[PDB]
Design a protein around this ligand. Structure first.
Ligand code: SF4
Lengths: 49, 303, 51
């Protein structure tokens, strides 16, 4: 989660389609953050195991 | 200076739109050796402003089509890089899907190119009668091929069954009348058979005199109609040897058609409901489909 | 072998094999296909021969 995920994201950092050139989707940096629960309406909250 | 040589070659190509051979370039510019001219031609071909043709007289160098422009909005590069295969297709035409796959461009760009080319009268879109899926694009100057589009039978991508039926009926009536006249003449068996015979040109002129439809019917069209009639088991065709005459269609051969009666009348199997039954396979003594409680035989005996 | 196939007959009539204009599209090559072409052995051999 600290090293290998970043390498995987870098291996596929750029994705583009053949049609309509000059269009692309570039990934910059990926984060995992702390554990949270999606119970609240559009709000996160710390949850214990 | 090779730039001057290239410019002079381009001017000579402009002077002769059909292409120029190496002899013409040598005569116009004799003070330059063959190696320099070859290098200049190689550079001209590398930069993409000339095309090479191999004719019975040798090699021809033609200026690439750039003056004929229908899509000037944007870049002439894609204009010519589409018109190239548009022309290559030419009479046979090419669907929009094939143009897209050959151009390796999105659908929007090729649609824009086609619209802009149609605006300045360079390409015409005609509906493919063989497979009415998309419209094929062809050169505006070329005549549309009958196989890919058009045809004496097809009218607006719709087969005229009534037209071919009327043609068959009229041809059969004419051949039957001719055979009846030949039989009634009873002058001599060989003369009778020769008179009952009808050449393709004769029946074609007869149909033309009738004038059932407005579309012009060629000789091969009436030939195909008579072939279909033969396939119907109603007429007979024979190929005789004739060098030249009023037909002059086939070299040393002439097709003569005559109305002939069938070999035997309807057989006995068809006279029974069992022979024309569509569920004949499921027939069984004891079951739902039994000859005792059959509806076909019931209606046949009642009639 | 080609010469023999051509001389299969004693006298060969003038063949009407005029080279129709088979000028293919310089299709825009996909980046993957372009890299494959660059990494092809024929391309490297031609580049070596250019010198
Ligand atoms: S349904 Fe009757 S008439 Fe028809 S095939 Fe069977 S037995 Fe014959």
């Amino acid at each position: 989660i600290n090293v290998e995920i970043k390498k995987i994201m870098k291996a596929n950092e750029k994705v583009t389609s053949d049609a309509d050139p000059m269009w692309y989707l570039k990934y910059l940096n990926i984060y995992v953050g702390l554990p949270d629960v999606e119970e609240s309406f559009n709000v996160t909250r710390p949850v214990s195991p | 200076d090779p730039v001057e040589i290239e410019n002079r070659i381009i001017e000579l190509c402009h002077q002769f739109p059909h292409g120029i051979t190496d002899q013409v370039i040598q005569n116009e510019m004799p003070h330059i050796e063959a190696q320099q001219r070859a290098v200049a031609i190689n550079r001209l071909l590398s930069m993409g402003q000339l095309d090479l043709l191999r004719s019975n007289t040798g090699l021809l160098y033609r200026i690439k089509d750039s003056q004929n422009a229908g899509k000037m909005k944007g870049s002439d590069n894609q204009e010519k890089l589409v018109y190239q295969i548009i022309e290559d297709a030419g009479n046979k035409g090419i669907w929009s899907r094939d143009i897209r796959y050959k151009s390796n461009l999105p659908l929007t760009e090729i649609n824009k190119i086609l619209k802009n080319l149609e605006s300045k009268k360079l390409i015409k879109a005609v509906k493919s009668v063989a497979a009415s899926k998309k419209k094929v694009y062809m050169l505006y100057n070329l005549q549309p091929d009958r196989s890919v589009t058009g045809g004496a039978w097809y009218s607006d991508q719709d087969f005229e069954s009534e037209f071919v039926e009327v043609l068959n009926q009229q041809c059969f009536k004419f051949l039957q009348s001719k055979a009846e006249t030949a039989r009634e003449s009873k002058q001599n068996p060989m003369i009778q058979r020769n008179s009952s015979f009808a050449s393709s040109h004769e029946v074609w002129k007869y149909i033309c005199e009738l004038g059932i439809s407005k579309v012009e019917l060629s000789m091969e069209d009436i030939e195909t109609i008579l072939n279909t009639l033969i396939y119907d088991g109603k007429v007979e065709m024979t190929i005789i040897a004739a060098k030249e005459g009023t037909v002059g269609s086939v070299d040393g051969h002439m097709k003569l058609y005559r109305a002939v009666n069938p070999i035997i009348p309807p057989t006995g199997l068809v006279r029974a409901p069992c022979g024309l039954c569509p569920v004949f396979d499921d027939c069984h003594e004891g079951g739902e489909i039994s000859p005792s409680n059959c509806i076909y035989m019931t209606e046949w005996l009642e009639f | 072998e080609a010469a023999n196939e051509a001389g299969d007959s004693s006298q060969d009539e003038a063949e009407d094999d005029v080279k129709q204009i088979t000028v293919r599209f310089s299709r825009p090559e996909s980046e993957q296909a372009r890299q494959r072409r660059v990494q092809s052995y024929e391309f490297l051999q031609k580049k070596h021969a250019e010198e």
